[PDB]
Amino acid sequence: DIRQVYYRDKGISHAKAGRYSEAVVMLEQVYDADAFDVEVALHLGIAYVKTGAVDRGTELLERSIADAPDNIKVATVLGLTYVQVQKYDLAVPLLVKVAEANPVNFNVRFRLGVALDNLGRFDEAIDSFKIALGLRPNEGKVHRAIAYSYEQMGSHEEALPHFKKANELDERSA
């Protein structure tokens, strides 16, 4: 049975190390939908999404949240994954949940702002962006996002400073 142990232990290790193609090749052989292992599904799911099997990976991630609906780690990948695929609606609750549990995770907060902006919730997106800026004040992309949000509400007077600040911090990357 160490035949399966190789593929599962190793495949996860590939998945964690960004070696996504090799993670698919192995974990494909270990995942069993009727004998569910969350740590396998999670990584095989990440690795399907990375290698362009988005629908397949998404559903595997959805099944993993089902097996453990309060596991923050799966909620993070799932939440992030939905944003990439432009399933913004489905992203928000998960990202809100994760940001609450994980206040120092910048990308989660930033993508939650992104998901919100896309949903037309401009003022909500700006609130989230500002929380993200609080974590990483040197991050010019966030001042730009805030600026676009304002712009989409016609508040050009409020956008301009944020655009200027964005420009300056891309200078600060010298």
PDB file of all heavy atoms in Angstrom, residues 2-14:
ATOM      1  N   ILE A   2       2.146   1.187   0.195  1.00  0.00           N
ATOM      2  CA  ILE A   2       3.064   2.346   0.127  1.00  0.00           C
ATOM      3  C   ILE A   2       3.106   2.949  -1.298  1.00  0.00           C
ATOM      4  O   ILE A   2       3.534   4.086  -1.505  1.00  0.00           O
ATOM      5  CB  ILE A   2       4.486   2.000   0.717  1.00  0.00           C
ATOM      6  CG1 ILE A   2       4.565   2.362   2.209  1.00  0.00           C
ATOM      7  CG2 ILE A   2       5.626   2.703  -0.024  1.00  0.00           C
ATOM      8  CD1 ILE A   2       3.725   1.482   3.133  1.00  0.00           C
ATOM      9  N   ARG A   3       2.636   2.160  -2.261  1.00  0.00           N
ATOM     10  CA  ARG A   3       2.300   2.612  -3.613  1.00  0.00           C
ATOM     11  C   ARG A   3       1.409   3.868  -3.656  1.00  0.00           C
ATOM     12  O   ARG A   3       1.639   4.768  -4.465  1.00  0.00           O
ATOM     13  CB  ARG A   3       1.606   1.465  -4.350  1.00  0.00           C
ATOM     14  CG  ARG A   3       0.386   0.875  -3.607  1.00  0.00           C
ATOM     15  CD  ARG A   3      -0.413  -0.028  -4.507  1.00  0.00           C
ATOM     16  NE  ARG A   3      -0.144   0.311  -5.898  1.00  0.00           N
ATOM     17  CZ  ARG A   3      -0.519  -0.417  -6.942  1.00  0.00           C
ATOM     18  NH1 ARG A   3      -1.207  -1.539  -6.774  1.00  0.00           N
ATOM     19  NH2 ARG A   3      -0.199  -0.019  -8.166  1.00  0.00           N
ATOM     20  N   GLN A   4       0.386   3.905  -2.797  1.00  0.00           N
ATOM     21  CA  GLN A   4      -0.506   5.059  -2.664  1.00  0.00           C
ATOM     22  C   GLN A   4       0.137   6.115  -1.776  1.00  0.00           C
ATOM     23  O   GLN A   4      -0.056   7.306  -2.000  1.00  0.00           O
ATOM     24  CB  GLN A   4      -1.867   4.657  -2.075  1.00  0.00           C
ATOM     25  CG  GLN A   4      -2.739   3.785  -2.978  1.00  0.00           C
ATOM     26  CD  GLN A   4      -3.669   2.858  -2.190  1.00  0.00           C
ATOM     27  OE1 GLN A   4      -4.425   3.302  -1.327  1.00  0.00           O
ATOM     28  NE2 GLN A   4      -3.613   1.562  -2.494  1.00  0.00           N
ATOM     29  N   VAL A   5       0.897   5.680  -0.768  1.00  0.00           N
ATOM     30  CA  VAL A   5       1.552   6.617   0.147  1.00  0.00           C
ATOM     31  C   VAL A   5       2.548   7.510  -0.581  1.00  0.00           C
ATOM     32  O   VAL A   5       2.691   8.673  -0.220  1.00  0.00           O
ATOM     33  CB  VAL A   5       2.258   5.924   1.352  1.00  0.00           C
ATOM     34  CG1 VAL A   5       3.750   5.734   1.099  1.00  0.00           C
ATOM     35  CG2 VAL A   5       2.071   6.749   2.616  1.00  0.00           C
ATOM     36  N   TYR A   6       3.240   6.966  -1.585  1.00  0.00           N
ATOM     37  CA  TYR A   6       4.228   7.742  -2.329  1.00  0.00           C
ATOM     38  C   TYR A   6       3.488   8.846  -3.033  1.00  0.00           C
ATOM     39  O   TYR A   6       3.733  10.022  -2.781  1.00  0.00           O
ATOM     40  CB  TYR A   6       4.998   6.889  -3.346  1.00  0.00           C
ATOM     41  CG  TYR A   6       6.172   7.614  -3.990  1.00  0.00           C
ATOM     42  CD1 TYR A   6       7.344   7.856  -3.267  1.00  0.00           C
ATOM     43  CD2 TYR A   6       6.113   8.054  -5.314  1.00  0.00           C
ATOM     44  CE1 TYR A   6       8.424   8.516  -3.842  1.00  0.00           C
ATOM     45  CE2 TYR A   6       7.189   8.722  -5.899  1.00  0.00           C
ATOM     46  CZ  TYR A   6       8.343   8.948  -5.155  1.00  0.00           C
ATOM     47  OH  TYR A   6       9.418   9.600  -5.723  1.00  0.00           O
ATOM     48  N   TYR A   7       2.544   8.450  -3.880  1.00  0.00           N
ATOM     49  CA  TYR A   7       1.775   9.400  -4.663  1.00  0.00           C
ATOM     50  C   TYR A   7       1.085  10.484  -3.820  1.00  0.00           C
ATOM     51  O   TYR A   7       1.103  11.642  -4.216  1.00  0.00           O
ATOM     52  CB  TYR A   7       0.783   8.685  -5.594  1.00  0.00           C
ATOM     53  CG  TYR A   7       1.405   8.037  -6.831  1.00  0.00           C
ATOM     54  CD1 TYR A   7       1.018   6.760  -7.240  1.00  0.00           C
ATOM     55  CD2 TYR A   7       2.352   8.712  -7.609  1.00  0.00           C
ATOM     56  CE1 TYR A   7       1.574   6.162  -8.377  1.00  0.00           C
ATOM     57  CE2 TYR A   7       2.915   8.120  -8.749  1.00  0.00           C
ATOM     58  CZ  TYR A   7       2.519   6.849  -9.126  1.00  0.00           C
ATOM     59  OH  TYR A   7       3.065   6.260 -10.247  1.00  0.00           O
ATOM     60  N   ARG A   8       0.510  10.135  -2.668  1.00  0.00           N
ATOM     61  CA  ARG A   8      -0.174  11.146  -1.841  1.00  0.00           C
ATOM     62  C   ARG A   8       0.774  12.094  -1.080  1.00  0.00           C
ATOM     63  O   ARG A   8       0.606  13.308  -1.147  1.00  0.00           O
ATOM     64  CB  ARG A   8      -1.233  10.532  -0.903  1.00  0.00           C
ATOM     65  CG  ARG A   8      -0.875  10.546   0.584  1.00  0.00           C
ATOM     66  CD  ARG A   8      -2.041  10.981   1.462  1.00  0.00           C
ATOM     67  NE  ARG A   8      -1.569  11.743   2.620  1.00  0.00           N
ATOM     68  CZ  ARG A   8      -2.341  12.493   3.402  1.00  0.00           C
ATOM     69  NH1 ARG A   8      -3.641  12.593   3.176  1.00  0.00           N
ATOM     70  NH2 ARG A   8      -1.806  13.152   4.419  1.00  0.00           N
ATOM     71  N   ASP A   9       1.754  11.549  -0.363  1.00  0.00           N
ATOM     72  CA  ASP A   9       2.693  12.371   0.400  1.00  0.00           C
ATOM     73  C   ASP A   9       3.417  13.324  -0.539  1.00  0.00           C
ATOM     74  O   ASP A   9       3.439  14.538  -0.324  1.00  0.00           O
ATOM     75  CB  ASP A   9       3.725  11.501   1.134  1.00  0.00           C
ATOM     76  CG  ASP A   9       3.119  10.679   2.271  1.00  0.00           C
ATOM     77  OD1 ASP A   9       2.057  11.076   2.802  1.00  0.00           O
ATOM     78  OD2 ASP A   9       3.719   9.639   2.639  1.00  0.00           O
ATOM     79  N   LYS A  10       3.990  12.742  -1.588  1.00  0.00           N
ATOM     80  CA  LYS A  10       4.803  13.448  -2.569  1.00  0.00           C
ATOM     81  C   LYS A  10       3.991  14.481  -3.357  1.00  0.00           C
ATOM     82  O   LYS A  10       4.422  15.620  -3.537  1.00  0.00           O
ATOM     83  CB  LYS A  10       5.429  12.429  -3.531  1.00  0.00           C
ATOM     84  CG  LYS A  10       6.621  12.919  -4.322  1.00  0.00           C
ATOM     85  CD  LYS A  10       7.908  12.777  -3.535  1.00  0.00           C
ATOM     86  CE  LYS A  10       9.094  12.715  -4.476  1.00  0.00           C
ATOM     87  NZ  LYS A  10      10.380  12.525  -3.751  1.00  0.00           N
ATOM     88  N   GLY A  11       2.821  14.068  -3.831  1.00  0.00           N
ATOM     89  CA  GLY A  11       1.955  14.928  -4.629  1.00  0.00           C
ATOM     90  C   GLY A  11       1.576  16.208  -3.920  1.00  0.00           C
ATOM     91  O   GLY A  11       1.550  17.272  -4.529  1.00  0.00           O
ATOM     92  N   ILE A  12       1.288  16.103  -2.625  1.00  0.00           N
ATOM     93  CA  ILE A  12       1.015  17.266  -1.775  1.00  0.00           C
ATOM     94  C   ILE A  12       2.244  18.179  -1.699  1.00  0.00           C
ATOM     95  O   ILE A  12       2.135  19.398  -1.829  1.00  0.00           O
ATOM     96  CB  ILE A  12       0.565  16.823  -0.354  1.00  0.00           C
ATOM     97  CG1 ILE A  12      -0.845  16.224  -0.405  1.00  0.00           C
ATOM     98  CG2 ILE A  12       0.618  17.984   0.637  1.00  0.00           C
ATOM     99  CD1 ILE A  12      -1.226  15.418   0.824  1.00  0.00           C
ATOM    100  N   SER A  13       3.406  17.565  -1.500  1.00  0.00           N
ATOM    101  CA  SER A  13       4.684  18.259  -1.460  1.00  0.00           C
ATOM    102  C   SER A  13       4.985  19.045  -2.761  1.00  0.00           C
ATOM    103  O   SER A  13       5.525  20.158  -2.706  1.00  0.00           O
ATOM    104  CB  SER A  13       5.785  17.243  -1.166  1.00  0.00           C
ATOM    105  OG  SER A  13       6.951  17.860  -0.669  1.00  0.00           O
ATOM    106  N   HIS A  14       4.626  18.468  -3.912  1.00  0.00           N
ATOM    107  CA  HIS A  14       4.651  19.181  -5.209  1.00  0.00           C
ATOM    108  C   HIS A  14       3.708  20.359  -5.258  1.00  0.00           C
ATOM    109  O   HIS A  14       4.112  21.473  -5.611  1.00  0.00           O
ATOM    110  CB  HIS A  14       4.283  18.244  -6.341  1.00  0.00           C
ATOM    111  CG  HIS A  14       5.301  17.182  -6.572  1.00  0.00           C
ATOM    112  ND1 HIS A  14       6.656  17.445  -6.569  1.00  0.00           N
ATOM    113  CD2 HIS A  14       5.170  15.861  -6.820  1.00  0.00           C
ATOM    114  CE1 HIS A  14       7.315  16.327  -6.802  1.00  0.00           C
ATOM    115  NE2 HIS A  14       6.438  15.352  -6.962  1.00  0.00           N
TER     116      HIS A  14
END
